[PDB]
């Protein structure tokens, strides 16, 4: 029961994020300064590159990244998660009622045992405006 490894982070201008996330561009997030909301095991850890997967941790991972930036209600929020040669994306139309976006994924991750390569990379933006009032949550859990 439960999972062997998991990491949940809260990313904001106050907790490790850029003072302003540029519009219409996807630059991977430095998560070293992110606030750890919950941590399980030691297989998943935050770093300047994203979320590191410890050696020997190949398997299935459930990942979710969400964002709310209530002061930006136009354009589309673009979200992206990368691991190795794979990248996953989604675009979420903004509105006052939905001032943000969400991306969730269940994927298989092969861990080579090379720290700089075995890392989940995260990024998002709004295609029409910079974000400087965002609350981003990133959670990853090894389910097998």
């Amino acid at each position: 029961g439960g999972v062997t490894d998991a990491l949940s982070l809260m990313y904001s201008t106050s907790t490790g994020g850029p003072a302003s996330i540029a519009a219409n561009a996807l630059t991977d997030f430095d998560l070293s300064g992110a606030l750890t909301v919950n941590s399980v095991g030691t297989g998943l850890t935050k770093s300047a590159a994203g979320i590191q997967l410890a050696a020997g941790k190949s398997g299935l991972y459930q990942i979710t990244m969400t964002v709310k930036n209530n002061t930006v209600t136009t354009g589309n929020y673009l979200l992206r998660v990368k691991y190795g040669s794979s990248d996953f994306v989604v675009a979420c139309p903004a509105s006052s009622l939905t001032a943000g976006g969400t991306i969730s994924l269940l994927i298989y991750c092969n861990v080579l045992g090379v720290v700089s390569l075995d890392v989940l990379k995260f990024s998002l933006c709004n295609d029409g405006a910079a974000l400087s009032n965002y609350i981003i949550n990133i959670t990853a859990a090894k389910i097998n």
Copy 2:
């Protein structure tokens, strides 16, 4: 193997939902009358407020809410899930082929032991028309 708590519901005009979900607005759903499709354990239960998390159930939760309302193929379906001070959203462009939307999340939930506060709240609508022919499925499972 398996999860300790889970709840899967089917929400419609015949099973607890409003006769008509207003357009372009997000009013949290009363799930007391929702049809229970599957239930595991007793940590997650349906209520007029949404889905209650029993005391002592802090942890990671996988959540999914989907909707199909085939007679509304225009505008954007707006979906929202809330827990405590956090809210998660997504907008899904409608079409005849995709007359609805989907929102899935893996999040950490802190349970304070205050029933009225420890509740997952759900809501959705179409930003251009009311929904009165919808099939909404909401499933939550505690994975850690």
Copy 3:
């Protein structure tokens, strides 16, 4: 710890997919030729119909289907997953930064013990152009 059954596939023109996925239409995918990236247990297997659920495997399933087709950056990527009488959809606006889409679901699956009926069906397209340079990943795991 871990899941009892899971299947992760990589679908492309080189690994079982159509030479060209027609625009604005959703025809279920023949996954018999998909590349198996990871397999756990024997409850979930690829077939010409989609992903078969073995008899006695009723329960909760976490499903994700993603697509990247970098040469198609316009219109909306439409994704759909079906099981029995239920269908789940999402539309994802394309862009150069998000040339694809994502759909993830946690749903309850009742297995009748009728192979042709107990199958997860998958489909996607772009509503404005055919796809002939796609990398589609489909992963399903029985979590309870």
